[PDB]
Symmetry: C6
Subunit: 267 residues, 6 copies
């Protein structure tokens, strides 16, 4: 079968849109414009991309990005076989060859100008240089490049270069408003609505502590964790300590603050 | 036999719970949520994980984590044989393939975004990219990811990224209270109870010197060492100098302080 | 066929000259003088080079430049085949062998004295040392060296060395004046002229914020993106947020400023 | 014969105990506890370890530790033979396999978390992961781990991590008192007792200059050198300049001070 | 034919001596003393060396020096052939074997003690250690070592070590006086004498701005470029902007100054 | 023939002793004590070592030391042959095997704890671990280790570690007094005695400028260069500019000072 069939999103992933990012991604795709998704960790960027891959009926090749990621990781390599020499394409190369969506997750993790590899794939005529193979690929007309990164979570030297930034269209994601986020919790875990709202208020409290002892507030992912634990019958206070507090802080006082909020919420 | 049989915990490891971490780990596991254990060195984190692996009847694949650990160490490699080419899975890959617990011990030792390798293994659909093999593994439904690290014992640049932190549930371990720690000493070494309490008071004294000449107080492991030495008939003052003082400090005055405490305790 | 035929520019690329850079590039070429194109990102440097390659009827071998680019990337290598040993030329070497234009795009990305590789190709007698092959190439009489870089977008240590700088003739590009840039938008996307002017005023507003919260103003490339999106029926305010604002800033206040400008322009 | 026979200490090495380190090392060994020897250079740490290896009748595998020492140096590797593929164990692996004493000399030289390799060999169940071979070794019940390092002679970043420190029992060595050190000189070189005392007073003088122009005083090893030279008929003043002064300082004034002390001692 | 025949300077290169460097280089050569040429970029150092190689009738092996240049680049390597193993000499090794002039151009680019490779080739008995081949070469009696570098154009840490500096005799080149430099322009390009003088005054103006907004004034090479462009019929103001201004500065005000000088010179 | 015959010093090298370093080196050798030679560049350290190798009738294996020197350079390696696998010893290993003098020239160039490789070769029982070969060499009873370095010419971090320093006996060389240095010039070049004295006064003048604009004064080697040039009929002022001034300074004023001294000396 096709090497891309394993990258197909089979069952529809649940995604709750916050604003018009679905239709706008479809517009970007119809114009084959590269897409950049920005936001804090755990606000549904990858699940958004994955939902779009489902809706467009396109295979999704996701690459998790490194600090030790060289240009080499993405493109492909020469395998020395008993047969004696065969070439094997990398993820980005497969996507570029057969019109798949390539999703560079946490692109800004990689060293900045290790990431200038994607520039030829964003020119008006999109190409991919496999210079170790000696091949010049013309990118499949249906190929779509998507990148993701958490702004402020990386160095200014590790930040995306302007030359790279200005090759993309962009969406800025943030954690959903209280109602939408509660709805996500309820849909994902089946936890009671009012309980979901309570969890969300705890998250709101931590997120309000951003810049005041926390580098980042509580993500939606951790709320999902807390709800999942509760649904398995874990005591609410324990679940929230375990999922919402211990992961994000080592500071004893911030911990005390969050735990007090939790104990005020769940008596 | 199964390649995992060597990773089975055979005999029940002695673990003394401090609070409800056993049942809560079982809850995390039933939901297949990644688990993070935080605490100072020698407070029983690895033995906790190992006890859980025993109680769950799961094989335990432990990886000791490096500063020179690349993404490469974990996944696996191509072996050039006389036969001519065979692939061999790494530890994490074996665990991910056949539903074992993979325990990344001292995860925060590794360069931060060398550690973003585990992100795909924490998505709602858990996968493991062997891109040097060209294989996309779907993680075994019983696979469980556990990491451990000592907060404050590493650089802020070497610290776990928020993107990684917020993918885990968390337990914070600390050294046990006096009675429990004494009980651990007695169970592990057979040393007399009152002597165990005395050792624990020396440890309490050093741990009170944390931030005042010591980077970290005396761990439970060193107390176990001291008790073991005494049980072999080493003089108490010598045993305590040897196990509780010399390992943790080079400062002559801190050494004098700890040795005075010891000599006040063991006349 | 010739290994250079794939590097031929087939269809005439649309380029709008700002001043006399076409004829002056032709003069540099007739004298075989190396050419350096300087300017901010997205001001048509690569498309200029590409247009010249079309007009001169020369193949264009473009290399996108790295931070991890070693001297090795450019020249070529030894391939271990089942046959048993064959050499394969790199891009620069092919261009130097058969009189093609070699275009080092973002040359200043690479480590400075990794870039002193091109010095022998700029002597009065132009040579290319393949010292790993043991070959001394005399550069084809029609070979032309072109480099590109964004000044100020790189480190002073990463900057081009004087020894390298003073081996080139130079063009300084900037974003076109309002009318010319509008004309480019209209030609490239078919967007209405007055709308093109409006987009350009938004770009002017951002470019005026350079040094006051922005590292670089809005490039022509992003204006093209915005126009393309509008032409696909995206709402003007959404298109401009998506193409002109989100890519270039993470600052909430700069974002507010640009978005206010946009909403003042497109009611 | 056994691969360990070459690591046997054959003839009894002369070691002069300062306090009860012999019996205490025997106690640590009977409990299979890892041992750490701390002290300045040339105070007999390695000769102590070597004497214990002689007295215990154990082979001694000594590894001199690097700044460029990776985890790789210690464990072993795959050799590509004409035969076609054989594995060869490293020093630590041989020691761990067949119950030898492995002595990591100057362990703190190596990058700190390159040295966390020895953690599995210090767990209550001692194992050695050869993950490049795919083998999990259970450490021989008679295997004994000993490390050595000079405190203050290395960076705080290069210093032993607390996680590593708190896995060892510890001895702190210092240069012997005057009489014992003289006795060592006499035993090792056959130099006259009163002369040995004189040499020792010169060493005392330099060691008193520690922190006042010297990073470290004169070691016992250099005293041995001076005595050896004198015994070969070198003039005392020349011998002391050559062995006790020139090796430890480049400062002309410190040199003048030490040389004046020497000339006051040896007229 | 001889592997050195390709390194022969065939046609006499035009070199205009400034002072007695020809005869003095001949004296250094007759004594086989290593030669060091110092000066700013584009003042004819390489063409001087090349002229001497012509006049002495010696082949010239030139090596362009790197920041990524290891000791390895210079000496040679083992090639794995289908035949199965052959050795191939590097440039320096060929020169050292058969009495050629080896010219390390921009030697100070390389990491300082990567450059201590040439020390054995400067001893009274000149040798070249190929320790990867296992060969000790005795340098050909006619071998001559020449190095070149731009002082102040490199780091103080990247600067030549004193140990290396004090192994060479030395010439300090600077840009020629007005008349000589004009003469060079006229000889090289056939541009009119008075025009050549005008170009030289522009260069004088920029070179006077050294330390006042310019890191280095206009080199002779760029003057040659300007003259060449003019000779091809490029407008004088355009030629001078293109060759003398754009290459050496990104500062808008320095650019304005130089352009004003040019427009004052060429009305 | 013996692999060491090429390392034999055949003809007696001219060395002028300054004090009793010959007999003292013979004493160190009779006791097999490692020797360290310290001094500025060009004061005859290597020629001293070479003279001792001649007088002792020992082969001399000299290694020039790197900043990129790893532990690997010294010991040896595995060669993949058509035959299929042979081992080849490195320089240090050959010397250690067959009782040659191994001379690590500029040892302090190498990274400090890359240089702790020589520690086992300085123990009372001298061994050499070839752990990549799996061999433990017992050093030949006639093996002699000599190192050389220029104090102050390297970083404090690049400086020799105390652990390494205190394993050697030591000689401190400085440039000879006026008469002896003149005598060296006369013997080496045949230049007239009074002229030799004049050259030496110029060197004295520069050496007096040490710390006042010069990092190091004029070495004896450069004086030899100047004398050699004069003997070939180079004008004294030109010879001294060329050999004594241009190599050691880029400062125009220091240059003026030295040149004035020269012109005062040689009218
Ligand atoms: N808009 C959303 N719709 C559905 N689920 C969401 C949404 N936002 C966040 N989530 C939840 O957050 C968790 C992590 O989402 P993910 O896509 O990994 O975030 P990111 O990729 O931005 O870190 C998922 O379990 C997902 O259910
Ligand atoms: N809760 C506990 N129960 C039993 N033993 C403990 C406990 N805490 C610490 N120890 C003892 O401490 C020593 C080291 O424990 P370990 O699991 O290696 O700590 P960590 O992994 O946190 O460094 C072991 O010998 C163990 O017996
Ligand atoms: N002078 C111009 N003529 C035509 N198109 C231009 C011009 N300047 C910029 N563009 C547009 O800008 C976009 C990016 O141009 P590009 O050549 O990649 O810029 P650079 O290489 O300087 O980053 C292209 O889509 C191109 O249409
Ligand atoms: N206690 C001791 N007994 C015998 N010899 C000693 C003693 N202490 C130091 N020495 C001498 O010091 C020299 C170096 O000792 P070594 O074991 O290499 O010290 P370290 O390993 O601590 O640097 C040896 O020649 C040894 O004879
Ligand atoms: N003395 C000279 N005689 C002839 N040409 C010169 C002289 N000095 C500089 N040039 C010109 O300068 C240009 C670059 O010279 P080059 O030898 O590359 O300088 P460098 O090697 O010092 O950078 C050449 O085109 C050459 O014609
Ligand atoms: N004592 C000496 N006897 C003879 N020649 C000397 C003496 N000192 C210096 N030289 C001369 O100095 C030059 C360089 O000497 P060298 O041994 O390379 O110095 P170093 O190795 O200390 O840099 C040689 O040409 C040598 O003739």
């Amino acid at each position: 079968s096709s090497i891309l069939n394993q990258y197909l999103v089979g069952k529809e992933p649940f995604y709750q849109p916050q604003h018009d990012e679905v239709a706008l991604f479809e517009a970007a795709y119809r114009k084959r414009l590269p897409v950049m998704v920005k936001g804090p960790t755990g606000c549904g960027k990858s699940r958004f991309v994955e939902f779009m891959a489902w809706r467009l009926g396109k295979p999704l090749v996701t690459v998790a990005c490194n600090e030790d990621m060289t240009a080499a990781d993405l493109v492909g390599r020469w395998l020395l076989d008993k047969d004696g020499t065969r070439w094997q394409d990398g993820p980005l190369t497969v996507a570029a060859r057969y019109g798949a969506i390539c999703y560079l997750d946490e692109i800004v993790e990689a060293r900045q100008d290790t990431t200038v590899v994607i520039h030829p794939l964003t020119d008006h005529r999109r190409t991919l240089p496999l210079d170790k193979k000696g091949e010049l690929i013309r990118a499949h007309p249906d190929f779509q490049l998507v990148i993701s990164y958490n702004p402020g979570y990386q160095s200014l030297m590790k930040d995306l270069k302007q030359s790279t930034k200005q090759r993309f269209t962009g969406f800025e994601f943030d954690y959903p408003n209280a109602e939408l986020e509660a709805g996500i919790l309820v849909q994902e875990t089946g936890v009671a609505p009012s309980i979901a709202a309570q969890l969300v208020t705890v998250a709101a409290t931590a997120r309000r502590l951003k810049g005041h002892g926390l580098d980042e507030g509580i993500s939606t992912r951790l709320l999902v964790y807390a709800a999942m634990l509760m649904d398995d019958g874990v005591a609410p206070r324990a679940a929230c300590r375990m999922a919402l507090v211990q992961p994000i802080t080592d500071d004893a006082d911030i911990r005390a603050t969050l735990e007090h909020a939790i104990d005020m919420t769940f008596a």
